Design a protein around this ligand. Structure first.
Ligand SMILES: *[C@@H](CC(=O)OCC)[C@H](C[C@@H]1CCNC1=O)NC(=O)[C@H](CC1CC1)NC(=O)/C=C/c1ccc(C#C)cc1
Ligand SMILES: *[C@@H](CC(=O)OCC)[C@H](C[C@@H]1CCNC1=O)NC(=O)[C@H](CC1CC1)NC(=O)/C=C/c1ccc(C#C)cc1
Lengths: 305, 305
């Protein structure tokens, strides 16, 4: 028993990380088959970042201006192209460590692991959620751009995130691996606001299920509630509306625990209106919304990869 | 910026995980050179575990009673020995993926990463602290025994923990890689008490520094305190006393933020006496004590492996 914020094992992604240097600028790239993916702002001067014209900056760049290093082996760049906010560098060698992989665009509320890297070398791994306002609460210093987010299924790495920037509020923004930003952000050094962020109601419920399995059952109540009744209280606290799809997603947890979904909703409604009166849930004094229902099942059933 | 509970990249350890079976009992082993290390209770049945005589049980076992799989290849066991609570299984081929490694006995208050495994395959990675009462707050199901905790120093993997059991309070207990339990525990299915746990004061301070680095500074006050005055209050709240060794360890963090250790101690002294007043620190309503000063420096300055 016990419940921890758990990342995927990173080994398959570690073997794809490389260092990419353009002039004064070094960051991380992802090396899959014969292609290295990285943020296109590798080509920028620190001046350029205020308002980069990326098309014109790239024209001044030849293949030899891109230094790609994998371990201590320089890879030879034989082509370059810009797709949205990512740069694709063709190299003369395919990564022998390329795992089975897919590029995916995740949905707000879904989770993934981040392998934070510097100079092409992995430094640590942690689990994030895509917030409803399309930011992530990460841990990223200068030099970390090019770090990627991913899920794993058995043997397949689903790449869903590449890191590009921090907002004034201290949260993080990035692209999918096709270079398309999540949310309304652009890759330049300027004031950028994220939306108001809501709480991922379906994830809080899944987490409450995990808590019950694990000994924290004091918030369960005799009362019940309807979906519409529950949702009226949810808006008041800035929680995402709960839909029948969300109910159905929670179905398996309901079954394994014998706690109907709307009974847990009733417990969450009462937690929201009255707080925790000195008790904790899975060691936290705040409701936690960055475990999906699948995360909860994976962790409480020992799913492997 | 940002501050997350961050595990070490796990690839070097994933390549050493294997499945170990003896009769009806399957758990994880750690394959380094031509030795597989696993918990000795792999040789027990369910009944045996109420009160095992491990020496007698091992005598009934032969090399061929031990089934070791590395991926889908079977490794032939050619020798076996008990060392304290771990079994050493000599195999016919050395692990080509063996990292540079050390076996270390860690100290209470130190942290490490756990690669939680089932049937020899990794399911996830997370950061734990060895509590002052020599338990860890992990996430372990049946089948997870033999999972290891470790730290990485550039290319060197320091293995410090192997998982063996769960206590009635829901926390976890295990051994170093020589088979010596942390704390007063035995590998038998009986109710066992850990002591009263205490809060790792030096770690809370380190986290307060991480909070300031990252924009949560409301708790800073203009006072200072003595190590003796501070420790009189700490002990009222079940905090480990702070020594001069602890101050010195916090020195570099002090220097990088310009906040003297004893000024942060004054801040923590107020937080304990006045509570947080519904404010949060790094997204927490509670004081966090599972980040060491080194964890904070490494994350807030980008050390890589
Ligand atoms: C990755 C940079 C990198 O690795 O390449 C340079 C070697 C950076 C990650 C940032 C660094 C600090 N925390 C992060 O997550 N990315 C950047 O620095 C962005 C580069 C621009 C996209 C092209 N820039 C920023 O993140 C800055 C954002 C910002 C602008 C203005 C204000 C105000 C007021 C606040 C934040
Ligand atoms: C891993 C053992 C394993 O994988 O063996 C099967 C091949 C187990 C991890 C436990 C399982 C539940 N959560 C865990 O972390 N380890 C064990 O099951 C222990 C085996 C004994 C060392 C020989 N047994 C326990 O951990 C159980 C302890 C216990 C809890 C509560 C009470 C009471 C009242 C009495 C004993």
């Amino acid at each position: 028993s016990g419940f921890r914020k758990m990342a995927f094992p990173s080994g398959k992604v570690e073997g794809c990380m490389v260092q990419v240097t353009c002039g004064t600028t070094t960051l991380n790239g992802l090396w899959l088959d014969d292609v290295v993916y990285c943020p296109r702002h590798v080509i920028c001067t620190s001046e350029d970042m205020l308002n980069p014209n990326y098309e014109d900056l790239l024209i001044r760049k030849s293949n030899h201006n891109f230094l790609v290093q994998a371990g201590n082996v320089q890879l030879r760049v034989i082509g370059h192209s810009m797709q949205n906010c990512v740069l694709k560098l063709k190299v003369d060698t395919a990564n022998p460590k390329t795992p089975k992989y897919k590029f995916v665009r995740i949905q707000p509320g879904q989770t993934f692991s981040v392998l934070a890297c510097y100079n092409g070398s992995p430094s640590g791994v942690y689990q994030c959620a895509m917030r409803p306002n399309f930011t992530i609460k990460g841990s990223f210093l200068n030099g970390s751009c090019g770090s990627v987010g991913f899920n794993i299924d058995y043997d397949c790495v689903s790449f869903c995130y590449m890191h590009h920037m921090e907002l004034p509020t201290g949260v993080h923004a990035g692209t999918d691996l096709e270079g398309n930003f999540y949310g309304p952000f652009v890759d330049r050094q300027t004031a950028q606001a994220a939306g108001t962020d809501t709480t991922i109601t379906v994830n809080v419920l899944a987490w409450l299920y995990a808590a019950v399995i694990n000994g924290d059952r004091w918030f369960l109540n005799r009362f019940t509630t309807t979906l519409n009744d529950f949702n009226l209280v949810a808006m008041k606290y800035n929680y995402e509306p709960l839909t029948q799809d969300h109910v159905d997603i929670l179905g398996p947890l309901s079954a394994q625990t014998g706690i109907a979904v709307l009974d847990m909703c009733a417990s969450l409604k009462e937690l929201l209106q009255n707080g925790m009166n000195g008790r904790t849930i899975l060691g936290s004094a705040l409701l936690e919304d960055e475990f999906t229902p699948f995360d909860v099942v994976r962790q409480c059933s020992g799913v492997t990869f």
